[PDB]
Amino acid sequence: GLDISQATTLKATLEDVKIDNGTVSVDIVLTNANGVPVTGLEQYAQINAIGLGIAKLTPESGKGYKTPQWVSYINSVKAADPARSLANYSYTDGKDSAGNPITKEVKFTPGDAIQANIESSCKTTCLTVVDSGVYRYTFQTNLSTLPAIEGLDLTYDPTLIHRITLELQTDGSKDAKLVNSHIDFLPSDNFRVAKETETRTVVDLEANCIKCHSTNYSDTSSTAKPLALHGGRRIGIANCQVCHTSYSKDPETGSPLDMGAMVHAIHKGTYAMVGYSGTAYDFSGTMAKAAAESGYPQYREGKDVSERVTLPVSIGNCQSCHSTDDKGPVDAASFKHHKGLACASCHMSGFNPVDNSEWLTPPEGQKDRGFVGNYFHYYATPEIDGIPGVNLVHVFQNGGCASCHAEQGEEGSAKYHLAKANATKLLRTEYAYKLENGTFDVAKGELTFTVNWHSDVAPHQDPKVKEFWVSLTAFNGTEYTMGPRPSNGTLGRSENRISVNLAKVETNANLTAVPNGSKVTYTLTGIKAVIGTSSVPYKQIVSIGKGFMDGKLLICANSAELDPTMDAAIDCSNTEAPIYEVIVGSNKASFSADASNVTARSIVISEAKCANCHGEKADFSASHALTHAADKPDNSCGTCHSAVPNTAVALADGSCVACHNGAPAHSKKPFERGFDFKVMIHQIHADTRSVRRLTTDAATFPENPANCAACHDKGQLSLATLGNKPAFLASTGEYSPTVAACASCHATTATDSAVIGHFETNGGVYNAAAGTYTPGSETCATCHGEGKSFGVDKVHPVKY
Numbered sequence: 135g136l137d138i139s140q141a142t143t144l145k146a147t148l149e150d151v152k153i154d155n156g157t158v159s160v161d162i163v164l165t166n167a168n169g170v171p172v173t174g175l176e177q178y179a180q181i182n183a184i185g186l187g188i189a190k191l192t193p194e195s196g197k198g199y200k201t202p203q204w205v206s207y208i209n210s211v212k213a214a215d216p217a218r219s220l221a222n223y224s225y226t227d228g229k230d231s232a233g234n235p236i237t238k239e240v241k242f243t244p245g246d247a248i249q250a251n252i253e254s255s256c257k258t259t260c261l262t263v264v265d266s267g268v269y270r271y272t273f274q275t276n277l278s279t280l281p282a283i284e285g286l287d288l289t290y291d292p293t294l295i296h297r298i299t300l301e302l303q304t305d306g307s308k309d310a311k312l313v314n315s316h317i318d319f320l321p322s323d324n325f326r327v328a329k330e331t332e333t334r335t336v337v338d339l340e341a342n343c344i345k346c347h348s349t350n351y352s353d354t355s356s357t358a359k360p361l362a363l364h365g366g367r368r369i370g371i372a373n374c375q376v377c378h379t380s381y382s383k384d385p386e387t388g389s390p391l392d393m394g395a396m397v398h399a400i401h402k403g404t405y406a407m408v409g410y411s412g413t414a415y416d417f418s419g420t421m422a423k424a425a426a427e428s429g430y431p432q433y434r435e436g437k438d439v440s441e442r443v444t445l446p447v448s449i450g451n452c453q454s455c456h457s458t459d460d461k462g463p464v465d466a467a468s469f470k471h472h473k474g475l476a477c478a479s480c481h482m483s484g485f486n487p488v489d490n491s492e493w494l495t496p497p498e499g500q501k502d503r504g505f506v507g508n509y510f511h512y513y514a515t516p517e518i519d520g521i522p523g524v525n526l527v528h529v530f531q532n533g534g535c536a537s538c539h540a541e542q543g544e545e546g547s548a549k550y551h552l553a554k555a556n557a558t559k560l561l562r563t564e565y566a567y568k569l570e571n572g573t574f575d576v577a578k579g580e581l582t583f584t585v586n587w588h589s590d591v592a593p594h595q596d597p598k599v600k601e602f603w604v605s606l607t608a609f610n611g612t613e614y615t616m617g618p619r620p621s622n623g624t625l626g627r628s629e630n631r632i633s634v635n636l637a638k639v640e641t642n643a644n645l646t647a648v649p650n651g652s653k654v655t656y657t658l659t660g661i662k663a664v665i666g667t668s669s670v671p672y673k674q675i676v677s678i679g680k681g682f683m684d685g686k687l688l689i690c691a692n693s694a695e696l697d698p699t700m701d702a703a704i705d706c707s708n709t710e711a712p713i714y715e716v717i718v719g720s721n722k723a724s725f726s727a728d729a730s731n732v733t734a735r736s737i738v739i740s741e742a743k744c745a746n747c748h749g750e751k752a753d754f755s756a757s758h759a760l761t762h763a764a765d766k767p768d769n770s771c772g773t774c775h776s777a778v779p780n781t782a783v784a785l786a787d788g789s790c791v792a793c794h795n796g797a798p799a800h801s802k803k804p805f806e807r808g809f810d811f812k813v814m815i816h817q818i819h820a821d822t823r824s825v826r827r828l829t830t831d832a833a834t835f836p837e838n839p840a841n842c843a844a845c846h847d848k849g850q851l852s853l854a855t856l857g858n859k860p861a862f863l864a865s866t867g868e869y870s871p872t873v874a875a876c877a878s879c880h881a882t883t884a885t886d887s888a889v890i891g892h893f894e895t896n897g898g899v900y901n902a903a904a905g906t907y908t909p910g911s912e913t914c915a916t917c918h919g920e921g922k923s924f925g926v927d928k929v930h931p932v933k934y
């Protein structure tokens with residue numbers, strides 16, 4: 135074998151568990167990455183951790199099926215530190231309908247609490263060498279003589295599945311010589327390993343979490359953000375599950391440490407607790423707000439962390455974390471079954487049995503179902519629920535018990551939770567359409583194009599179609615440029631873009647529709663511009679004469695239809711149930727003088743990678759809420775500003791760059807919060823944007839922003855033509871294209887004259903007078919293109 139002092143990697147597996155009159159042992163099989171036994175562990179002076187846990191999987195009972203839950207054998211009752219037991223606080227947030235300020239209250243319930251834990255302090259004292267690289271760990275903890283803990287059943291039951299976990303770390307290693315392992319087994323059958331179907335998994339790191347989270351544990355960069363907890367030693371889900379049990383709490387706050395309640399509340403931005411060394415972790419950001427507004431002496435800037443989690447999907451998007459495609463854990467369907475803490479962790483945010491003690495008592499002559507049960511059955515309202523507008527009691531009264539209480543194989547509350555996502559997919563398939571290329575007779579000012587629609591009931595004839603936008607944008611073959619803001623025109627107020635609502639043909643004097651079965655041919659007139667030095671509507675559409683067309687169809691859907699075998703689409707004018715909008719995009723068609731294709735804009739990011747975090751086909755109309763959001767995209771200021779809807783769909787095909795490019799029109803922002811798409815997106819996700827329009831909170835990006843592969847595919851960053859693009863002209867001056875791309879992280883202002891000088895030495899311009907840069911002048915690609923001497927793929931912590 136190889137001495138641990140010289141082993142550069144560790145791997146470990148657990149086997150041959152033995153439990154005898156309460157005495158537990160397991161073998162740790164330790165090797166390096168090439169499978170050579172690693173010897174010397176039991177004498178090594180550089181061990182950071184050898185922690186072993188053990189838990190039993192215990193059944194749960196109630197109405198319907200309830201999933202089994204882990205009970206650790208190893209626990210203690212933790213006292214609260216008095217100084218760090220968080221006081222309640224309140225803070226202002228917005229105004230009510232009469233214009234008066236709204237105050238919100240945050241409440242805690244500090245007090246003694248149980249916490250599950252593992253055996254960590256024994257380490258080599260509990261080791262015996264059984265073979266080369268095979269170390270038997272015999273627990274100090276005897277299962278027969280565990281201290282009684284009130285309300286916890288710690289009896290050893292060999293007929294239950296058990297789990298033993300290992301955390302092993304040497305040499306301060308974040309990865310190479312860190313391991314989390316476990317083994318799940320059945321003592322009553324000779325301690326054999328458990329089948330996947332016998333044990334409890336629920337979520338899987340790869341299937342359910344890495345879509346957002348970095349797992350680059352070794353990342354040495356300044357912006358590293360791997361999902362590694364408790365100083366870095368804890369990385370494996372199975373290890374979390376032994377301590378993060380249903381009964382474990384933080385005594386400083388009363389907050390649940392249950393894996394599900396904790397993870398839901400973290401990602402909802404409601405969780406707050408005090409952890410190791412008395413550090414407060416407030417995932418809402420509201421503690422810092424109260425401290426600044428009112429004073430809150432327990433919040434210590436620079437030590438405690440109070441930041442609002444910014445989740446890139448809705449907290450209702452269960453499928454971001456819970457597999458429904460049978461490619462995740464075999465018990466993935468566990469999220470369909472009621473469990474008090476799980477259901478509470480979204481619907482009962484901020485409530486507790488002290489401050490809401492009335493809910494401990496059910497209404498006269500109804501059965502007591504406990505605190506959470508009584509809320510769901512009796513006391514919930516839309517006005518107070520953790521999910522605004524949700525009416526759980528209406529479901530109790532009118533929806534039938536199986537709406538929440540599910541036998542194995544049934545959907546339970548997932549009938550409600552997944553209803554809109556499911557109907558959305560079906561409606562996008564039903565209403566799918568294709569845009570054929572446009573013929574633009576520029577002298578006549580007329581564009582003709584045919585939509586291949588899903589049926590012979592045309593868009594304007596279908597009252598389920600709310601609007602059907604097609605937007606045309608001029609593209610000169612090099613890059614989009616929004617250009618200056620013109621005076622208003624009949625069709626819009628942009629030089630390079632027109633958005634037309636095909637659903638309102640009959641009241642639009644500039645639009646005619648001629649059907650031919652399921653094909654509808656539209657003719658849009660009045661696309662005329664006097665071309666000179668002045669800005670006028672459609673100036674670039676006319677001068678260039680070609681570009682692209684993008685569809686954004688809005689369908690009305692019925693929130694009250696929960697039966698997937700029924701039609702979810704509904705007449706937009708219906709007033710009996712709430713309607714939600716389903717968005718259906720399209721191919722990006724060309725328009726040109728003869729309807730020939732216009733060569734596509736290069737693709738330099740990955741659609742699928744944006745969707746890893748934001749989910750499939752994320753909508754960004756709400757991102758356009760700040761300014762002239764209510765103005766329609768065919769009407770004056772709304773041509774650019776609309777949020778009703780924003781008229782782009784796809785993220786990686788230049789649809790957004792139609793506007794977000796180097797030439798924002800007016801009222802311009804400076805570079806450090808620039809409009810150009812690459813600048814803006816880099817800044818948001820790297821937290822280098824000086825000000826975000828709609829929030830004071832920086833994005834909490836769950837990857838490393840310097841991991842370019844989070845958004846870019848290999849080969850997309852040659853930089854070979856980037857210098858040929860026009861400069862980005864911000865408020866104060868312009869920035870050449872590669873300079874803009876890199877400075878958006880590296881130099882948002884001229885704080886470091888060596889960095890700025892480096893740009894300028896190599897053909898770049900930084901905050902220069904408009905017109906300074908000549909396309910072709912940057913020489914960056916020669917050194918920084920992928921694979922080159924200082925290639926972007928070499929100098930950044932990428933994970934392709």
Ligand code: HEC
Nearest residue numbers: 249251252363368369370371373374377384408409410415
């Ligand atoms: C016992 C050995 C644990 C293991 C294994 C894991 N966690 Fe843990 N965690 C544990 C306790 C007792 C506490 C509360 C400590 C207290 O002072 O009350 C926590 C806390 C967290 C938190 C909150 C923030 C923090 O305190 O650092 C998080 C986000 C957290 N734990 C996550 C977590 C994950 C995801 C784990 C597996 C990879 C995991 N922990 C393992 C105890 C233990």
Ligand code: HEC
Nearest residue numbers: 201336337393394397401450451452455468469471476551
């Ligand atoms: C990731 C950010 C999540 C989101 C989004 C949703 N859930 Fe979740 N859920 C998550 C974890 C890590 C866990 C804990 C698994 C464990 O080991 O305890 C859960 C658990 C639940 C449960 C309880 C399951 C059980 O204990 O058997 C339920 C009922 C549940 N989740 C439901 C649920 C719903 C309905 C969601 C969308 C509205 C949803 N979760 C989102 C992680 C995440």
Ligand code: HEC
Nearest residue numbers: 449450471472473476477480521524525529538547550554
């Ligand atoms: C956050 C991850 C949640 C968890 C955990 C649970 N629920 Fe939930 N619920 C959540 C949202 C975002 C929604 C709204 C869905 C929508 O399309 O708007 C709901 C809704 C419900 C409902 C329907 C209420 C109504 O239509 O008025 C029910 C009956 C419901 N949720 C029950 C429920 C149960 C029993 C849970 C534990 C299994 C549970 N929810 C967890 C968000 C989250």
Ligand code: HEC
Nearest residue numbers: 196197473474477503506507510526529530534535537538
């Ligand atoms: C979601 C809106 C619910 C509906 C509809 C019904 N119940 Fe329920 N119930 C719900 C929760 C979140 C809880 C608490 C579970 C916990 O772990 O704390 C309960 C509890 C019960 C119980 C107690 C046993 C249990 O399953 O935990 C019973 C016996 C019960 N509920 C019965 C019941 C009946 C008969 C229903 C239809 C009339 C009904 N529930 C609807 C959530 C919801």
Ligand code: HEC
Nearest residue numbers: 346444445446739743744747757785833834835837844845
């Ligand atoms: C996870 C590692 C991400 C990937 C990959 C991408 N995005 Fe993202 N995005 C992420 C977070 C955590 C946030 C903050 C969310 C919030 O509510 O504050 C964002 C934000 C955006 C935004 C801004 C939305 C707004 O401020 O109105 C945009 C426009 C956006 N993201 C776009 C986007 C694109 C185009 C991506 C692929 C190139 C992409 N994101 C990837 C997390 C992650």
Ligand code: HEC
Nearest residue numbers: 754757758759760761773774775782783789790793826827
């Ligand atoms: C022109 C018709 C636009 C298209 C197409 C897209 N955006 Fe946009 N966006 C536009 C304007 C005029 C504004 C200014 C603010 C306003 O409310 O009108 C914006 C702003 C944004 C922001 C603001 C983020 C910040 O400053 O912190 C975001 C996140 C944003 N836009 C994202 C975005 C995406 C992802 C687009 C394609 C799906 C997109 N926009 C298209 C004008 C236009």
Ligand code: HEC
Nearest residue numbers: 619627628760761770771773774798799800801802803809
């Ligand atoms: C596209 C050709 C536009 C039209 C038509 C209108 N505006 Fe605009 N506006 C546009 C952009 C690209 C920007 C952001 C510039 C940047 O560099 O980030 C803006 C900004 C504003 C603002 C400032 C607030 C903001 O969200 O940044 C205001 C108050 C504003 N625009 C007003 C406005 C009005 C009143 C318009 C119709 C008369 C109008 N804009 C049209 C692009 C375009």
Ligand code: HEC
Nearest residue numbers: 337342343346400443444445446447454455747834835836
């Ligand atoms: C994007 C939709 C996510 C998915 C899927 C998962 N998580 Fe997440 N998580 C996300 C964000 C935006 C944040 C805040 C920023 C950050 O990376 O910390 C988090 C945070 C957590 C945490 C707290 C980490 C800490 O403070 O050290 C935990 C413990 C966590 N996330 C766990 C986790 C699990 C187990 C997931 C799969 C079931 C998971 N997250 C999915 C975004 C997203």
Ligand code: HEC
Nearest residue numbers: 738739811812815819839840841842844845856875926930
């Ligand atoms: C998602 C959050 C991103 C991360 C992480 C990185 N970049 Fe990016 N980049 C992003 C977008 C949305 C765009 C514009 C897409 C478009 O259609 O125009 C860009 C663009 C670039 C460019 C310009 C490339 C070109 O047009 O030839 C460069 C040079 C660039 N990005 C560099 C880059 C590097 C080196 C990163 C790791 C440090 C990186 N990006 C991360 C979105 C995202």
Ligand code: HEC
Nearest residue numbers: 354355356357816820839840875876879918924926929930
């Ligand atoms: C934010 C998404 C970035 C973009 C866009 C670009 N870079 Fe970057 N870069 C970024 C970070 C956070 C770091 C530090 C990484 C670390 O190890 O701590 C870097 C690093 C570099 C380096 C290393 C050289 C040095 O700074 O010592 C180089 C040479 C580099 N970056 C170049 C570079 C180029 C040419 C870019 C545009 C094509 C570029 N970066 C964009 C973050 C981001």
Ligand code: HEC
Nearest residue numbers: 872873876880889893896897898912913914916917918924
């Ligand atoms: C070779 C002759 C290069 C040319 C052409 C360009 N750059 Fe460069 N860059 C080069 C080196 C050797 C370094 C330092 C690497 C190190 O580890 O010390 C850099 C650094 C950068 C950075 C990092 C800046 C920082 O924050 O420290 C950036 C963002 C960068 N270079 C960008 C850049 C631009 C935009 C270029 C065209 C104008 C360009 N470089 C050309 C080597 C070379």
Ligand SMILES: [Ca+2]
Nearest residue numbers: 384386408409
């Ligand atoms: Ca604590």
Ligand SMILES: [Mg+2]
Nearest residue numbers: 639642643645
């Ligand atoms: Mg007409």
Ligand SMILES: [Mg+2]
Nearest residue numbers: 758761763775
């Ligand atoms: Mg707007």
